[PDB]
Amino acid sequence: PEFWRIINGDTMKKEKNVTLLWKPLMKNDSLCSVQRYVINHHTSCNGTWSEDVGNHTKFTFLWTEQAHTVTVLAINSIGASVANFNLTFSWPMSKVNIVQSLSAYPLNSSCVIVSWILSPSDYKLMYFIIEWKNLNEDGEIKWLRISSSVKKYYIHDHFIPIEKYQFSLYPIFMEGVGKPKIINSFT
Amino acid sequence: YPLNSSCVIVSWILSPSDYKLMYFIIEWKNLNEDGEIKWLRISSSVKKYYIHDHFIPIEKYQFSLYPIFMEGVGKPKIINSFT
Ligand SMILES: *[C@@H]1O[C@H](CO)[C@@H](O)[C@H](O)[C@H]1NC(C)=O
Numbered sequence: 001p002e003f004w005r006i007i008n009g010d011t012m013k014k015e016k017n018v019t020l021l022w023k024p025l026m027k028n029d030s031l032c033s034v035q036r037y038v039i040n041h042h043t044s045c046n047g048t049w050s051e052d053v054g055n056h057t058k059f060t061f062l063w064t065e066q067a068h069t070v071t072v073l074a075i076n077s078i079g080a081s082v083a084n085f086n087l088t089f090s091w092p093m094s095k096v097n098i099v100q101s102l103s104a105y106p107l108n109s110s111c112v113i114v115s116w117i118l119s120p121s122d123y124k125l126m127y128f129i130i131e132w133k134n135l136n137e138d139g140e141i142k143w144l145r146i147s148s149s150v151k152k153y154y155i156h157d158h159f160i161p162i163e164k165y166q167f168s169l170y171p172i173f174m175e176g177v178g179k180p181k182i183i184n185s186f187t
Numbered sequence: 188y189p190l191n192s193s194c195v196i197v198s199w200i201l202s203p204s205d206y207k208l209m210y211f212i213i214e215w216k217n218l219n220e221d222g223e224i225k226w227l228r229i230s231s232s233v234k235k236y237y238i239h240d241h242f243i244p245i246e247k248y249q250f251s252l253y254p255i256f257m258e259g260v261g262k263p264k265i266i267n268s269f270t
């Protein structure tokens with residue numbers, strides 16, 4: 001399952017509390033079932049901590065180290081999931097981003113625009129995650145995987161014309177997550 | 188100019204011509220999208236006629252209006268993009 005993280009807490013503390021969320025596997029991806037869910041922790045110190053979430057689809061974690069690696073697996077009666085995604089975050093990396101511009105405009109009641117230009121970087125970048133939230137009401141967190149090859153992408157989802165949704169595009173690093181560019185309303 | 192999210196007004200100024208003209212022909216295309224050429228027929232009399240379809244304001248578009256005579260075709264009047 002594609003697992004995504006979110007900050008819910010104060011920033012002054014050296015430690016950080018992180019909440020994970022992932023989409024439960026569907027039938028074809030499950031191969032007739034995916035019953036337990038297992039989380040394996042990892043750090044730059046290489047401290048591995050494996051826990052079994054089970055049917056629950058969210059997990060809360062906290063730690064004081066700058067770097068920590070998460071590799072969420074899935075347990076099946078045949079065995080654990082061989083191939084799973086990854087994400088790593090580092091505080092010095094989290095303070096730098098190379099994205100320059102951001103915009104949003106409803107072309108329809110079911111379509112909105114994302115446009116962005118980026119300053120050149122020095123290391124490699126793999127993908128972007130785009131999450132948007134409504135400013136009038138605090139709705140559920142919604143996002144979807146976006147690759148780095150594409151430069152301009154059509155979001156196609158149901159929308160309320162009177163409601164104005166904030167947008168925040170997050171850059172991703174191999175060992176870090178750069179700080180997002182946050183816009184409160186459509187351009 | 189884009190009046191709504193899915194339309195652009197087509198306005199122009201027609202220079203006097205010693206030879207007559209019956210109608211015109213409007214084209215619009217995207218340089219970066221490289222989409223297929225679209226065309227609806229426009230008479231020489233109507234000034235503010237326009238066609239509505241789903242566009243993208245950020246993208247770079249290409250409109251061109253040609254004058255058609257009864258004996259020849261005038262050179263294209265090509266605009267870089269909507270202002
Ligand atoms: C994380 O998983 C992906 C795909 O399963 C793999 O390509 C990548 O090398 C892994 N990273 C680490 C640090 O294990």
Ligand SMILES: *[C@@H]1O[C@H](CO)[C@@H](O)[C@H](O)[C@H]1NC(C)=O
Pocket residue numbers: 107108109110111241
């Ligand atoms: C809304 O407009 C967009 C413009 O491209 C189009 O792709 C989409 O199908 C339209 N949706 C409806 C429900 O008409």
Ligand SMILES: *[C@@H]1O[C@H](CO)[C@@H](O)[C@H](O)[C@H]1NC(C)=O
Pocket residue numbers: 190191192193194239
């Ligand atoms: C937006 O386009 C025109 C403005 O030129 C307007 O008359 C029309 O009603 C609008 N379209 C929709 C689908 O509301």
